[PDB]
Design a protein around this ligand. Structure first.
Ligand SMILES: CCCCCCCCCCC(CCCCCCCCCC)(CO[C@H]1O[C@@H](CO)[C@H](O[C@@H]2O[C@@H](CO)[C@H](O)[C@@H](O)[C@@H]2O)[C@@H](O)[C@@H]1O)CO[C@H]1O[C@@H](CO)[C@H](O[C@@H]2O[C@@H](CO)[C@H](O)[C@@H](O)[C@@H]2O)[C@@H](O)[C@H]1O
Ligand SMILES: CCCCC/C=C/C/C=C\C/C=C/C/C=C/CCCC(=O)O[C@H](COC(=O)CCCCCCCCCCCCCCCCC)COP(=O)(O)O[C@H]1[C@H](O)[C@H](O)[C@@H](O)[C@H](O)[C@H]1O
Ligand SMILES: CCCCCCCCCCCCCCCCCCCC(=O)O[C@H](COC(=O)CCCCCCCCCCCCCC)COP(=O)(O)OCCN
Ligand SMILES: CCCCCC(=O)OC[C@H](COP(=O)(O)OC[C@H](N)C(=O)O)OC(=O)CCCCC
Ligand SMILES: [Zn+2]
Lengths: 268, 233, 75, 30, 487
């Protein structure tokens, strides 16, 4: 009531004094420091009357930048720091195919070679971290290792792999079942069936892993504070005192990950 | 100098005291919105007096990080994900260039390796995607390929092209009109007239594209999105 | 000269900065508690001097009493 | 919204103000 | 008005300022440390100017209560004996700071801080006129020197040398502390001026004198206890050896001059043949063992034992030539020996070795170093025109007047001293080069040239006109010669 109003007015006075002190301290610094501003980074952006068509189930990290004509299929994911610039031409991302951290997918200027085609990425493909794609036509069920660079005009056929730290030269086709790699990107070896199983399992594991990141990066301020308080409360345990009190403190469901992302599916 | 640093630190102390007072005033009123974990990233960050100087007609992506004494010419562009960190020395970016997506142009972090060479970028210079320019220098109207890894002490002459993914070793000079590629970088072939014309046209194409990207980035922040984020149930 | 007020203020500032250093924090983390430490150090030093004077006076009185008690042995 | 709602927190603020004022008076009056 | 308070507080401020400076600012740390050392040196030089040389009373006296009944208190004062020691211990610190200038990025702020705390502790040692507090600052030097030896040692041997030095210093220290306590209980106080006017029973003079000798003889290694000095000296940084030999070896002789030669005039006379015997064989044995050493820093370290044992012959002669001439030798030794370790430090910093075998023919590649090294070789071998000869000859004429035999034995010290001093120079400097071992050279830089300049000037200035130093001491050393005498 009256006490609450008085305390509110005192708080207003204190806030005004604090802001004045902040301004004075900024003045003494010589106005050299560049003040932090509101985040102007747009996760999804338009360029020329063209909007991305990100599907409902896709996980697009807030630090990612999906720009221009980008079409992304269900179950796929775009991870932190990734850039998909489809301003000049089209970029189509298939279903279940994840583009990993700091990766760049860009499309040529439709005249880099005269007969340029849009960047097409098939289904259930996985692209490693820091990879660079500049006009490829990666077919479905393919693997691109982390750090690999795919120049314009290349096609990665189904069930083919590009070794990490490779450079596939322009107009180079990787046949099915090969592990083309190296800086010239020459033939290394044939793919074994275990490698194919590993590729499919990695794609499915990333589809499974994108969900917790999506559920964590979309929380509100109120939910974040509650989860932080719960995490602090259950960080350390004391079974002896609980046994003395006859209680059993159990971790809330907000701090429990699904068993399908644990190393071996641990129920307990 | 040393007199300026003392005033800078005292200003930090007073600003910290003022922020603490503001937080205390917020707590009396019951508000706790200062606890929000907002991103502290600044597209233009300074180190004491070393502040980037960006021309008005230059596109700098909001996610690009420019730190220290960095000079950007008119018509140049720093695209998304770029990190241009020059603190121990200066990073000079000319007019009409284009630091393309996820590229890195930085200077050496210590004097133990020797003398830190300032990074100089000419005019109409094309830097490929995810390319590292670590204390090198490039003349105007040159091309740096995708994934290139130029090191310090490297001079790339005018009309010189560095092939994609090539790693130019320390203290290497690329002669004018020659393409250097592979690991380590070695002479491969001589540039043709058509490639020179394409290199010249790419700079103008990216300069025009940067204007559209800046126009789409300078629009007022959407209030519908802000309201939707505010109410999440 | 060196008064108790200044040595107390220096000890308070030093113990504040020492506490901040022991926790891997910057020396001038919270300036307000540095000021509080300076004030508390000055107060404690002045009180210590004021207590020391009275303590010495009491010791002198008590030793006078003890010597007077011992001197009675010769009668 | 010019009202502080938490009654318990308001009493803590009043007690802190009273403690500060009493300490100042104690250091002044004696 | 320059007093002993400011001279002692200057290193305190210097060490406190660097204590709260970020380590990333390496330049600022070095500048502030060097400036503090130079300011302290100028303060000492000013204190020299206003020093009266006609009164035996202690000058610039300052008092600070320690016990509640003023039984023991901080009494600071200087006389003609300890003034030059203060000047030397304030002059050596900036040189030590300048030694580690290039490689200072790795040492950090803990290096200058340690050296400034060292300077603080050594200034108070030469200025204390209280027997107990002289012991407190006497043994407070261990911690900074222990840290210097251990943290910034050369090889893994630093753990052994630090342990050995610490153990020897402790065993001397506590056996001295028992005597100090017995003196305090009997007399009542520990003030030096009061302890010099109290008659000690003849039975108690021998015990107290022996107990004092136990601690002092360790820091002026006589014969049984000069085995810690070589190891701890070789396992030390270049600036660390300058402190150990420049000043830390002057505590024993100063302790004898201040607390032994006066508080027991009768005990000193009885033990005079004992000191003459130990010093005579130490000069003969050490100057002979020096010939068969192969380490560069282990040869000069053995050139100090012979020189410092020649000093204790001078002090116990109890005449103006002896006591007065022994002071000049320590000032000369503090400059000549500390300059030789700079020369070795120059060689070690470039070529990480100390064996004399690897060195030879440097006269053709490092000529400025050879010229400077030769000059201090001449000073180390007691050449006239150098500060060492004045002290060396004045001690001989002070001991010949008391005992002709001890002056004869001590005279063979310069026979052997001139043997290894030039023979080392011939090996290291003269001869043919050895490109198989070492082939890259660099003569003295700007720092090394400038660092040696005050040593060059201060060595001939004392060597050709020692009257400036001598006339400031005769009033103070003559009152020291006779204390119990009244005729
Ligand atoms: C660890 C740091 C080491 C620093 C010490 C060396 C530096 C020198 C400063 C030492 C210092 C501060 C002590 C700091 C305490 C440390 C802080 C503890 C932690 C704090 C976080 C005390 O030092 C003086 O105090 C005197 C006691 O008064 C004592 O003199 C003996 O007393 C007799 C007994 O009765 C003995 O019989 C007799 O033999 C001696 O005369 C001596 O101790 C000494 O002279 C400086 O003096 C300070 O106190 C007094 C002066 O007295 C001053 O104010 C006084 O107030 C009234 C008296 O209450 C007086 O009416 C008033 O007139 C006077 O103005 C101060 O303005 C200031 O000058
Ligand atoms: C530029 C020149 C000036 C430059 C100088 C400027 C000076 C500004 C004036 C006064 C500065 C006052 C300094 C006093 C500061 C005291 C410490 C602040 C204490 C404080 O957390 O606040 C109240 C607490 O309530 C009290 O339990 C105890 C709090 C009682 C004390 C609060 C009363 C403050 C009123 C001061 C009078 C203002 C009169 C007007 C002043 C403005 C002038 C117009 C908020 O509780 P809370 O539950 O919401 O939250 C707290 C808080 O977040 C943290 O302490 C913990 O993390 C948390 O666990 C919880 O404890
Ligand atoms: C004596 C030689 C000379 C030394 C120099 C003396 C100088 C005078 C003293 C200067 C002291 C400077 C201190 C400046 C004020 C800072 C105090 C702020 C503490 C505070 O805000 O309260 C909470 C903790 O309380 C606390 O931290 C209280 C800690 C108190 C510990 C000791 C309590 C008294 C014990 C009796 C004396 C000790 C034994 C002596 C025989 C902070 O909470 P938070 O935000 O940090 O987070 C949770 C951590 N809990
Ligand atoms: C004049 C400014 C008073 C500002 C009062 C104030 O902020 O108290 C909080 C501080 C630190 O306590 P917190 O961990 O809750 O940080 C809370 C922190 N504000 C934060 O943002 O996290 O308390 C002190 O140490 C100071 C004790 C001496 C208080 C006089
Ligand atoms: Zn591109």
């Amino acid at each position: 009531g009256t006490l609450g109003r008085a305390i509110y007015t005192v708080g207003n006075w204190i806030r005004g004094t604090g802001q004045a002190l902040d301004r004075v301290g900024s003045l003494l610094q010589g106005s050299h420091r560049i003040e932090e501003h509101l985040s102007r980074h747009r996760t999804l952006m338009n360029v020329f009357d063209k909007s991305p068509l990100v599907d409902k189930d896709v996980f697009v990290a807030p630090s990612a930048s999906v720009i221009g004509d980008v079409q992304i299929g269900k179950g796929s994911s775009i991870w932190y720091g990734c850039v998909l610039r489809g301003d000049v031409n089209n970029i189509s991302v298939g279903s279940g195919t994840n583009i990993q951290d700091n990766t760049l997918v860009h499309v040529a200027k439709t005249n880099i070679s005269g007969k340029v085609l849009p960047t097409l990425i098939g289904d259930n493909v996985t692209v490693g971290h820091s990879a660079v794609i500049h006009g490829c036509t990666v077919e479905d069920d393919a693997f691109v290792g982390m750090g690999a660079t795919l120049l314009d005009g290349v096609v990665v056929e189904k069930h083919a792999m590009v070794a990490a730290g490779s450079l596939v030269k322009q107009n180079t086709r990787i046949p099915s079942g090969e592990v083309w790699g190296g800086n010239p990107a020459k033939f290394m070896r044939k793919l074994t069936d275990e490698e194919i199983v590993y590729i499919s399992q990695s794609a499915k594991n990333y589809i499974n892993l994108a969900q917790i990141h999506a559920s964590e990066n979309s929380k509100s301020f109120e939910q974040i504070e509650v989860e932080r308080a719960l995490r602090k409360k259950y960080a350390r345990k004391d079974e002896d005192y609980d046994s003395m009190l006859g209680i059993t403190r159990e971790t809330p469901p907000e701090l429990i990950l699904p068993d399908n992302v644990l190393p071996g599916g641990k129920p307990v | 100098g040393t007199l300026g640093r003392a005033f800078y630190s005292v200003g930090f102390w007073i600003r910290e005291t003022g922020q603490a007072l503001d937080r205390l005033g917020c707590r009396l009123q019951g508000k706790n919105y200062f606890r929000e974990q907002l991103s502290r990233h600044r597209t233009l960050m300074n180190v004491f007096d070393k502040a980037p100087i960006v021309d008005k007609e230059a596109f700098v992506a909001p996610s690009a990080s420019v730190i220290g004494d960095v000079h950007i010419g008119r018509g140049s562009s720093i695209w998304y994900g770029c990190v241009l960190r020059g603190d121990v020395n200066t990073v000079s970016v000319g007019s009409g260039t284009n630091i393309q997506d996820n590229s890195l142009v930085h200077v050496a972090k210590s004097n133990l390796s020797g003398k830190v060479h300032p990074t100089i970028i000419g005019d109409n210079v094309t830097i490929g995607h995810s390319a590292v320019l670590h204390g090198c220098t490039v003349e105007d109207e040159t091309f740096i390929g995708m994934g290139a890894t130029l090191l310090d002490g490297v001079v790339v002459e005018k009309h010189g092209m560095v092939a994609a993914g090539a790693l130019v070793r320390q203290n290497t000079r690329i002669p004018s009109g020659e393409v250097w590629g592979g690991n380590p970088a070695r002479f491969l072939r001589k540039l043709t007239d058509e490639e020179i014309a394409f290199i010249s046209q790419s700079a103008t194409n990216y300069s025009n594209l940067a204007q559209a990207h800046a126009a789409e980035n300078a629009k007022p922040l959407n209030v519908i999105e802000f309201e939707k984020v505010l109410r999440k149930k | 000269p060196i008064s108790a007020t200044m040595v107390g203020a220096l000890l308070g500032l030093g113990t504040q900065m020492y506490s901040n250093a022991l926790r891997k924090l910057p020396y001038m983390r919270h300036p307000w508690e540095h000021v509080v430490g300076m004030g508390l150090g000055a107060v404690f030093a002045n009180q210590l001097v004021k207590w020391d004077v009275k303590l010495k006076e009491d010791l002198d009185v008590m030793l006078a009493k003890a010597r007077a008690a011992n001197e009675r042995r010769y009668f | 919204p010019k009202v502080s709602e938490d009654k318990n927190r308001n009493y803590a603020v009043v007690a802190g103000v009273v403690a500060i004022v009493g300490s100042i008076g104690w250091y002044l009056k004696a | 008005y320059f007093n002993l308070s400011g001279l002692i507080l200057c290193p305190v401020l210097g060490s406190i300022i660097l204590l709260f400076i970020p380590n990333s600012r390496i330049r600022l740390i070095r500048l502030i440390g060097l400036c503090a050392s130079l300011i302290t040196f100028l303060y000492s030089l000013v204190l020299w100017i206003q020093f009266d040389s006609s009164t035996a009373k202690f000058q610039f006296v300052e008092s600070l209560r320690w016990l509640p009944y003023e039984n023991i208190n901080f009494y600071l004062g200087i006389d003609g004996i300890s003034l030059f020691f203060v000047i030397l211990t304030t002059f050596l610190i900036p040189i030590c700071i300048l030694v580690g200038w290039s490689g200072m990025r790795s040492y950090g702020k803990e290096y200058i801080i340690a050296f400034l705390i060292c300077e603080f502790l050594m200034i108070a040692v030469f200025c204390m006129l209280d027997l107990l507090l002289f012991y407190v600052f006497f043994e407070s030097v261990l911690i900074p020197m222990f840290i210097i030896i251990g943290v910034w040692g050369s090889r893994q041997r630093k753990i052994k040398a630090a342990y050995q030095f610490f153990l020897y210093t402790l065993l001397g220290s506590l056996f001295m502390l028992l005597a100090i306590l017995l003196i305090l209980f009997q007399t009542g106080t520990t003030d030096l001026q009061i302890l010099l006017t109290t008659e000690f029973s003849e039975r108690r003079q021998i015990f107290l004198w022996i107990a004092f000798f136990a601690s002092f003889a360790v820091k002026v290694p006589m014969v049984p206890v000069h085995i810690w000095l070589p190891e701890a000296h070789v396992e030390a940084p270049t600036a660390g050896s300058v402190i150990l030999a420049g000043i830390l070896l002057k505590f024993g002789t100063y302790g004898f001059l201040r607390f032994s030669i006066p508080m027991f005039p009768e005990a000193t006379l009885c033990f005079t043949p004992f000191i003459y015997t130990l010093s005579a064989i130490a000069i003969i044995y050490t100057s002979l063992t020096t010939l068969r050493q192969i380490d560069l820093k282990k040869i000069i370290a053995y050139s100090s034992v012979a020189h410092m044992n020649l000093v204790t012959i001078g002090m116990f002669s109890l005449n103006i030539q002896g006591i007065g001439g022994s002071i000049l030798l320590m000032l000369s030794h503090g400059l000549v020996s500390s300059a030789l370790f700079l020369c070795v430090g120059v060689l070690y910093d470039r070529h990480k070795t100390r064996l004399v075998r690897y060195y030879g023919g440097l006269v053709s590649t490092m000529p400025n170093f050879s010229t400077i090294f030769f000059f201090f070789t001449l000073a180390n071998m007691s050449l006239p025109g150098t500060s060492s000869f004045i002290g060396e000859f004045l001690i001989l004429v002070g001991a010949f007047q008391r005992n002709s035999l001890v002056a004869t034995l001590a005279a063979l010290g310069m026979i052997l001293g001139a043997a290894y001093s030039l023979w080392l120079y011939n090996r290291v400097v003269s001869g043919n080069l050895k490109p198989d071992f070492l082939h890259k050279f660099s003569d003295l830089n700007g720092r090394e040239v400038f660092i040696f300049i005050p040593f060059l000037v201060g060595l001939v200035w004392m060597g050709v006109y020692p009257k400036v130093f001598l006339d400031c001491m005769h009033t103070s050393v003559s009152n020291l010669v006779q204390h119990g005498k009244f005729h």
